[PDB]
Amino acid sequence: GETTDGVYRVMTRRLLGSTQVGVGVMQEGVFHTMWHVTKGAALRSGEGRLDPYWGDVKQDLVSYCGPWKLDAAWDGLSEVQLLAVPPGERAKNIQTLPGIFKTKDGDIGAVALDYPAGTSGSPILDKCGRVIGLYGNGVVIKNGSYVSAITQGKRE
Amino acid sequence: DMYIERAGDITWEKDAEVTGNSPRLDVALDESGDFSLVE
Numbered sequence: 001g002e003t004t005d006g007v008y009r010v011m012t013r014r015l016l017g018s019t020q021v022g023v024g025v026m027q028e029g030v031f032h033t034m035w036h037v038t039k040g041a042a043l044r045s046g047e048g049r050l051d052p053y054w055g056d057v058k059q060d061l062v063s064y065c066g067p068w069k070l071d072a073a074w075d076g077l078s079e080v081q082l083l084a085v086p087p088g089e090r091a092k093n094i095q096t097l098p099g100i101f102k103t104k105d106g107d108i109g110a111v112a113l114d115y116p117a118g119t120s121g122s123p124i125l126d127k128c129g130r131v132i133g134l135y136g137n138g139v140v141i142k143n144g145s146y147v148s149a150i151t152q153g154k155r156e
Numbered sequence: 157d158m159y160i161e162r163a164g165d166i167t168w169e170k171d172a173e174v175t176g177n178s179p180r181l182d183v184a185l186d187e188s189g190d191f192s193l194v195e
């Protein structure tokens with residue numbers, strides 16, 4: 001199948017038409033997305049099959065064909081870019097300064113950017129182009145707007 | 157059956173659109189992976 005590095009749409013035909021349930025990242029032969037996008041199910045890449053290899057519902061992450069490869073981290077200081085991939089619309093970079101989720105287990109970056117639900121799993125980048133985490137697990141705040149965590153896994 | 161379609165190279169774009177605010181929020185993470193606003 002298509003093993004090429006880059007950002008990919010996740011699509012289903014089980015609803016009406018072809019529907020974008022979310023987004024993902026291919027790197028070093030491994031496909032990375034959020035657990036709530038696939039719920040752990042297998043994926044088709046043309047003739048090709050992708051099988052789930054690692055996942056955790058609490059981190060809300062899943063890898064396919066191999067272990068989690070994305071290890072870069074927000075430095076706590078700089079702007080970043082959401083490589084947003086909205087349903088039926090073209091990829092598109094958005095630059096933002098992250099906010100903070102304060103938790104009982106320590107602090108994580110947050111991106112206050114609003115997109116449809118099927119944008120879930122769109123990658124966040126640092127200035128060198130490295131993926132620091134996935135967009136699309138977070139909270140709805142006062143306004144009615146959405147804030148996502150910068151969700152990142154661990155590389156072995 | 158779900159399937160994947162390539163949508164872009166992962167690069168930083170100079171003169172991307174710059175927007176969004178940067179809230180500092182207190183949040184809880186449950187066993188199901190749901191974040192919630194703690195106030």
Ligand SMILES: COc1cc(COc2cc(C)nc3ncnn23)nc(N2CCNCC2)n1
Binds near residue numbers: 117137
């Ligand atoms: C792009 O990723 C996502 C994921 C989700 C997940 O769905 C919901 C629904 C509700 C009722 N409250 C929620 N609290 C946290 N997530 N969450 N929702 C959205 N959005 C964008 C803004 N409009 C629509 C909701 N985007």
